[PDB]
Design a binder for this molecule. Sequence first.
Ligand SMILES: Cc1ncc(C[n+]2c([C@@H](O)CCC(=O)O)sc(CCOP(=O)(O)OP(=O)(O)O)c2C)c(N)n1
Ligand SMILES: Cc1ncc(C[n+]2c([C@@H](O)CCC(=O)O)sc(CCOP(=O)(O)OP(=O)(O)O)c2C)c(N)n1
Ligand SMILES: Cc1ncc(C[n+]2c([C@@H](O)CCC(=O)O)sc(CCOP(=O)(O)OP(=O)(O)O)c2C)c(N)n1
Ligand SMILES: [Mg+2]
Ligand SMILES: [Mg+2]
Ligand SMILES: [Mg+2]
Lengths: 556, 556, 556
Amino acid sequence: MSVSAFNRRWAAVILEALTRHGVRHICIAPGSRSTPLTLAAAENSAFIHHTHFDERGLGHLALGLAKVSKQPVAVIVTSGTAVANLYPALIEAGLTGEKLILLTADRPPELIDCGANQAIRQPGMFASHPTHSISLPRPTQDIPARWLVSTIDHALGTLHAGGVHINCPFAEPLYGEMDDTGLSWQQRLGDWWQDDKPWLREAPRLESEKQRDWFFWRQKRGVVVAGRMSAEEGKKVALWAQTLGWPLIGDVLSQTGQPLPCADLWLGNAKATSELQQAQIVVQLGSSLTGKRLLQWQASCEPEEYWIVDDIEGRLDPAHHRGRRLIANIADWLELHPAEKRQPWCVEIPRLAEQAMQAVIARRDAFGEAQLAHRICDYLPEQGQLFVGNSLVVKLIDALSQLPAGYPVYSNRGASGIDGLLSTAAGVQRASGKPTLAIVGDLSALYDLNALALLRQVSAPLVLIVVNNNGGQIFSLLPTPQSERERFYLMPQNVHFEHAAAMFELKYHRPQNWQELETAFADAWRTPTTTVIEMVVNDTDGAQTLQQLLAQVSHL
Amino acid sequence: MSVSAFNRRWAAVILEALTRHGVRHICIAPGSRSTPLTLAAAENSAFIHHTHFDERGLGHLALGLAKVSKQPVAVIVTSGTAVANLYPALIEAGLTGEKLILLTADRPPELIDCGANQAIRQPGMFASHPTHSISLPRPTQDIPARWLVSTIDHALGTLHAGGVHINCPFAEPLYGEMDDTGLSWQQRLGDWWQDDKPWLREAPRLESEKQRDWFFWRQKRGVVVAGRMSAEEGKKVALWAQTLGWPLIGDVLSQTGQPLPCADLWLGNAKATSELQQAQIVVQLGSSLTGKRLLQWQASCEPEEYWIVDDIEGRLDPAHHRGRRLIANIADWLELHPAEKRQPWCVEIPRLAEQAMQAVIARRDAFGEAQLAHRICDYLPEQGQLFVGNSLVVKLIDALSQLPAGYPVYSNRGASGIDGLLSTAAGVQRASGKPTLAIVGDLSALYDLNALALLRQVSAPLVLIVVNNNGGQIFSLLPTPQSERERFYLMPQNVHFEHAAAMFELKYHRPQNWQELETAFADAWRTPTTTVIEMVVNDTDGAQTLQQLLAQVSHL
Amino acid sequence: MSVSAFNRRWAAVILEALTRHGVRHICIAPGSRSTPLTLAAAENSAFIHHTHFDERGLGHLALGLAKVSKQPVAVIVTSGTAVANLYPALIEAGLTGEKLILLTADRPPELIDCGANQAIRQPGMFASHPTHSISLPRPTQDIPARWLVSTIDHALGTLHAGGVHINCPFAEPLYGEMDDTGLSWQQRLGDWWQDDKPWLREAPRLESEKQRDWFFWRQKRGVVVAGRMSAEEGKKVALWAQTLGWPLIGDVLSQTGQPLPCADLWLGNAKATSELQQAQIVVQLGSSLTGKRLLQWQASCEPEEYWIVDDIEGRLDPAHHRGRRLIANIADWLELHPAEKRQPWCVEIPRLAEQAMQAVIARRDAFGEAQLAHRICDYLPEQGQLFVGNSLVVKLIDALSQLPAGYPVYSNRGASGIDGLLSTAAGVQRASGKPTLAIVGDLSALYDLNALALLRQVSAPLVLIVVNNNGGQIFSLLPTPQSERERFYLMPQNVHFEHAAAMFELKYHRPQNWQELETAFADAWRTPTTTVIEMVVNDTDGAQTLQQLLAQVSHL
Ligand SMILES: Cc1ncc(C[n+]2c([C@@H](O)CCC(=O)O)sc(CCOP(=O)(O)OP(=O)(O)O)c2C)c(N)n1
Ligand SMILES: Cc1ncc(C[n+]2c([C@@H](O)CCC(=O)O)sc(CCOP(=O)(O)OP(=O)(O)O)c2C)c(N)n1
Ligand SMILES: Cc1ncc(C[n+]2c([C@@H](O)CCC(=O)O)sc(CCOP(=O)(O)OP(=O)(O)O)c2C)c(N)n1
Ligand SMILES: [Mg+2]
Ligand SMILES: [Mg+2]
Ligand SMILES: [Mg+2]
């Protein structure tokens, strides 16, 4: 009876079970207690293995992989704070739906709360942020393998969205010669080992029914709001709203083509909000709305009914409107509630939106971050994808740019953390294999700086733009008090990123003008490597430029 | 009734209450939801403020400050994944006793579970790892200020060791002019505002009683095991064990002067374990024993009684011996249980230890990490302190070096995470103002790389030795299969650290021999700045040198 | 490898371990899954076994035993809702400190969440209400017996107060021939089996330090408030306050002799409140103060310092005064802070207390519940003890009677549940062997009615007075709205208790006047049995009488 061998048979059942639920990517950090899990995964030919030394970055790498692939993505870490570092990505997945399967090695129960090295209390340490939590018992042949495979199958099969924490205690010895221990225990499962389905198939679907009064509401004065959704969903929603004749307020994350662009500006104009008061229903598809003026308009508007369609569960309207919360695949939902051609009812807002875009176009020349956002369309890689960071970049693009319909945009806009953007971008790139443009701020790039290691391996060109305004300049846009703004809010670090690029052998450009930025991009798309482009700009120009465009358009 | 003003009065009560329990250092990360806490702290003259952009590093900075200063240390972060990043340091503090007071700003309850940006479930998110958890209510004048201060005073007053999670929801508006809203609410507390004491004094002491049969047991054949303790405590334990005539097995963390050095080697010798079988009692002071051979001997020994004296609560013997678990300040415990002069009963172990050290000296010449550990006394700054990283460095120093009695050693040997070593060393340096030698591995340095930002501000010279053996070479010691060793265990990243140091404008050396290392040190001690010394060594030389020395000493 | 036998050896280690921490009484409910625990308990001769069929009642029986004996009391229930029924007594123990050890049998992990009969999720099902929770692992010889005993030893050894939940999963077969499986596993513990000590002695004492400025504060104008404490402690507190010349406000639970009786009445008089605002310090010993006027005076008074001395931990002043919380054995605390002989400073309150008592005595004649309460001192059994139920009985006794110093009083005044009073009283009687007077209301008697089964076995006479005012007439005392008062507050059940008594073969009396009541008492004290005395009174006479006395005394 080799405990080491049986540990690995147990682990093998876990990993093999995960392959029956679409787990292809597995992100592994180093350790010894994780040996049963890590070796079982290394020997399993279904997996693509990714490795990293920072478990926080590892969780975000998995998050980007799951985010793009729409499949569950596995993680293996050893016991201790390695497990805790998964918390940020797990929380994000809890908000936006990524299926992260966290296999967290643990000490056996006899070694907890007795002063053993690298042993902590792991069951339940993520509280309610996992969708499902499994604390596996101490491995033993007296618990049949069909129990273990059934537990995994229940968790993955019923997983609508979010993370799964599977705590995996293993007792030492962890190494030794692998004999027959556990083989007949495994072979109890018979030809399941040669099958391609779960041992237990439990996959109920969670979805809202057709709205039987839709033929009434689609003829009222409605507004369509498009939040985060897939690229194809964005094109379908644009066509649907156009057909209804309802104005479409389209978020940077919507990939609708934003037919009424610069909503963050023109929603600040009284003629627009006055026109939107006529709306009798608001139908929102997707969530995590980006722009400040849009969140204020949502909070203040009073349609008779407010609907939010999304495949995420729970309430998504932070203003708590009377109305409906409809759980569905958006494309399914649109087919279930088709539009019928009706003439448009807005007259003032299309003109305001065009005038707003003209007001931004008037200011495109300065080599600043607002202008980079406004012009970002010109740098999108063909057949590529955009990963947009948090703080000012996503806000400025949403307010100032009109992104093409169906061009994929990815982001971390659940909790909007600045702590994993580089490694998330790495996973986003690796999952699809597409050329990738990623744009982040300086503090964000410092936060996830060691994920540049991961960016040394990309399967297609990845451009990382670091906007360096020397601090978190979103807080210059906020009414912070001037006496404490720098030390306690902006926190300028006074760095550049050429030495960072050189450390990880990444190409680097610090362009001084539009010509040099173009040159840097043209060089960058030529090889499957990461190029770091640092755009150094004056601290508060971007925030000021947005405030000024905001005032101007409000006076139209 | 300005929400903004009252928010700031509420927060002001929280921070001022913390000043009555010795909180002096406060570590602050940037954010908007945290504005009430951050501004209250910025206005309160009792605090020393430290700032950082990475909240994981922020937590470890607080941990090092608290570890050295023995004072409770406060942290302020904004809502979201920023809170989750505190989990590693919080867990470590729960193991080794540092008092971290985490003021975690939160959205108000009406903005939880409704799709609100940067809003997550924060109460209870640290599960059972905080010593105390306080989920403060939504601020309101209808709850009296004496409840708020009384709750904080209860948490801080009863805090024997570990972290306190104080979750602080605040509703917007967060900014505005300070009017008199909440002023009379504050003035309910009277002249407590001019006092220097808690509003409620609740400070019961948790301490074990004097052992009435101690005069019986001190006459038996005992062994003293000295784990992590204060420097003064290490010296007192040395004198105490010497007077009793009992052998002292002294950990690298013990600061006892290790009179039987290289215990990790001679404990592998059957004559040593045979002599130690004669011991009728083992009295261990401190815990988190470092060495493998020591943990194995502790696991196998069967004294009549095994005692562990420590100010940490709970079980500390991972082998679960029959015996006693005594909660006490170690110096206090020694005074309550004095030694009586007795002739020593060990004869063979002193000789074995002298031979072990001589065998190590025979190998001191190679420019390797085993030799660096062995020779490390030659580089300790006068009246300074040593911060020792995890994995091979602490193990090699413990096995191969004899550190001087009472010279301060610091570490993160609770969970032994490699995720916060640089920011912890920064806090350790700032707490004492002493010149500091910190030594970490390459993967540890990459893990906490951005904490080089913090090392741009030290009050005395800090030498950071980064031992670069290209991966986690502690894992070459385990019998992992060679087929997966590099990719799935060692994870070499193939970097150097010259550009990291240059990025943060820190002096850098890559010495090639002992004299160049001496030159680097002499350069480093001249100014109160951080110097990065990268020691490049071959992958497995250190590990296999330790194995060979173990075989040699074990066959003596 | 008999699973049945090993289950029983694992259980045997658990029970034997408890005998080393003073567990003498064990309360057992019937079941099959609990067989290992139950049979281990039955063959262990250290225990006194009590049985009951209602697990809620069983927990309260354990609570009464622990409440009197001040020793830990063990409980065994089987899996399922039986475990949930322990919650009330566990919560009460969490407030007032009884050490109830809950051994809750469980299904093994492979039978959780799979549709198995009588299997529920039991780990953590009591949330934070146990002082300590242990979720034992699935029994196996691969976890050594020293681990199990050390876990129990940690839990019991550090238990200052409150409950311990020990969840004990067992896999079938539960029955079978008892062979040698697990015998050498037990024997690893050596002669620990013949010992009388814990395997691990871990017993730190939690106690507040001596107040170094006590000689300053005892010379000021103080008030002594005496809450729940032991009978001895009540006598010592009376002597101490008398020595200081400080007024003593003595609760019904204090056993101080209440030298200023009827505080619930004279505290309503403004001359008392005005004189009491001269007080510079209030020293309260014990907690769970009974009377409304006393709670109101505590809420409004503002001494310079407010101290609460008690052996219960945590805050105990629901008004959150500036002052001190001091954790100590109350008698020890008085010896550490002795009184000094000083002239009394109150003049008006003694006159008021005397006049108030006179006002109550003027109304002693009517055959009502207020008069029974007022006259209860004249009926206490010699060398006996009083168990006072919740709602009006304890309020009226506290307001209207003067109980003798040092005469034992017991109650459930933590959460003041009306759900376990009869079974608690049974435990109170069985623990001390003393003749017992227990007084409850009609709804309270219905709540725990089947606990009449337990009252068939008492070791000395127990009188159970059931005051039948046809509903919860405390809700006639509150300003409830009259239109809904009967159906939704009073809830009269219109029963008597003659047939209940008859069902359990208990002697029964329904006295119609004082003479018949005294005859009933005289009959009852002659034999070691339970006699039920039902006192039928008109619904609102007690509540109104108390209101009238309050108004009258308030105008003196
Ligand atoms: C892990 C964590 N911790 C702290 C924060 C708080 N937080 C922000 C949110 O408030 C902004 C959410 C949003 O975009 O809506 S923004 C921000 C500064 C960003 O600095 P930058 O990269 O230089 O970019 P710039 O501001 O354009 O100059 C911080 C520090 C966080 N989000 N996540
Ligand atoms: C946050 C987290 N995540 C993962 C781990 C697992 N873990 C280790 C545990 O074995 C440490 C037990 C010990 O320190 O004795 S060591 C180690 C590699 C260290 O690489 P290095 O700095 O180059 O040093 P070297 O090995 O001497 O070459 C890892 C990755 C962890 N501890 N903490
Ligand atoms: C398990 C549970 N559930 C409900 C309650 C609420 N509760 C009470 C407490 O609130 C009284 C607070 C106190 O005593 O300080 S009293 C009470 C009615 C009692 O009726 P009775 O026995 O006929 O006695 P009488 O009112 O004097 O005639 C109820 C129903 C509870 N305490 N516990
Ligand atoms: Mg910035
Ligand atoms: Mg290394
Ligand atoms: Mg009643």
